[PDB]
Amino acid sequence: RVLLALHDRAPQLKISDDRLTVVGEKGYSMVRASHGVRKGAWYFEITVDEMPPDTAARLGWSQPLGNLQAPLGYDKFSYSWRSKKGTKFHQSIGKHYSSGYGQGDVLGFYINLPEGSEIIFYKNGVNQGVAYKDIFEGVYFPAISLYKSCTVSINFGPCFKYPPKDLTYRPMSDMG
Amino acid sequence: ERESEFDIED
């Protein structure tokens, strides 16, 4: 019920029939999920199915105005985590955050929007730290940006590969 | 296009 949005995606990205897998094409471009969140704590996972050394992803959360024809984290509307070097991006500013991630990894994506906000990334069940705090108010959508022909699969829940031990949340699938 | 094409420099 919660899926990659067909109406809200860069045309060059290749979306699977089940709308849970996406393949990138050349320069960065983005797709958002069909549902977003404004309040409370929420979670989803992305698995990197394939990612050769020349490809890359920036994954995280975007409001509706985030530019689909640019990397996630490019403008004020999104916050992202780069596979290459584990850099965090927002308004096109890259900052050190964690170690990088790649093919085979299962990344977790936590947000908390009390109404104090926080974005936390996970790698294979391991909390990589609070990336951003007190973020721009608005509705946030799970988001995927890809560079070149890598492939990733998103899971909105309710069944996660590495359900975090250290905090409470609802699966994004609760919105569907 | 480069991976870092959009990124602001330090």
Looking at CA atoms only, how far is residue B7 from chain A in angstroms? 5
Contacts of B9 in chain A (CB under 8 A): none
- Cα first-last separation, chain B: 20
Phi, psi of A173 (to 5 degrees): -60, -20
Of all residues in chain B, the one with the smallest CA distance to A147 is B3
Instruction: Give the whole-angstrom CA distance, residue A135 versus residue A68.
Output: 20
Among A26, A84, A93, beta carbon nearest to B1: A26
Q: A130, A19 in Cβ contact below 8 A?
A: no
The CATH number given to whatever domain includes residue A40 is 2.60.120.920
Closest alpha carbon to A54 in A150, A170, A130: A150
Burial profile A34-47: b = 16 or more Cβ within 10 angstroms, e = fewer: bbbbeeebbbbbbb
Looking at CA atoms only, how far is residue B5 from chain A in angstroms? 8
Among A26, A27, A94, beta carbon nearest to B7: A94
Looking at CA atoms only, how far is residue B1 from chain A in angstroms? 6
SS3 A172: helix
Instruction: Give chain B's radius of gyration (CA, Å).
Output: 7
Torsion of CA A85, A148, A173, A140, to 10 degrees: 70
SS3 A45: strand
Which residue range is the domain that position A57 belongs to?
A: 1-176
User: For chain A, how many structural domains are there in total?
Assistant: 1
Query: Helical H runs in chain A?
Result: none
Put simply, the answer to whether B6 touches A74 (Cβ < 8 Å) is yes
Chain B residues within 8 angstroms (CB to CB) of chain A: 1, 3, 5-8
A89 touches chain B (CB under 8 A): yes
Q: What one-character DSSP code corresponds to residue B8?
A: P
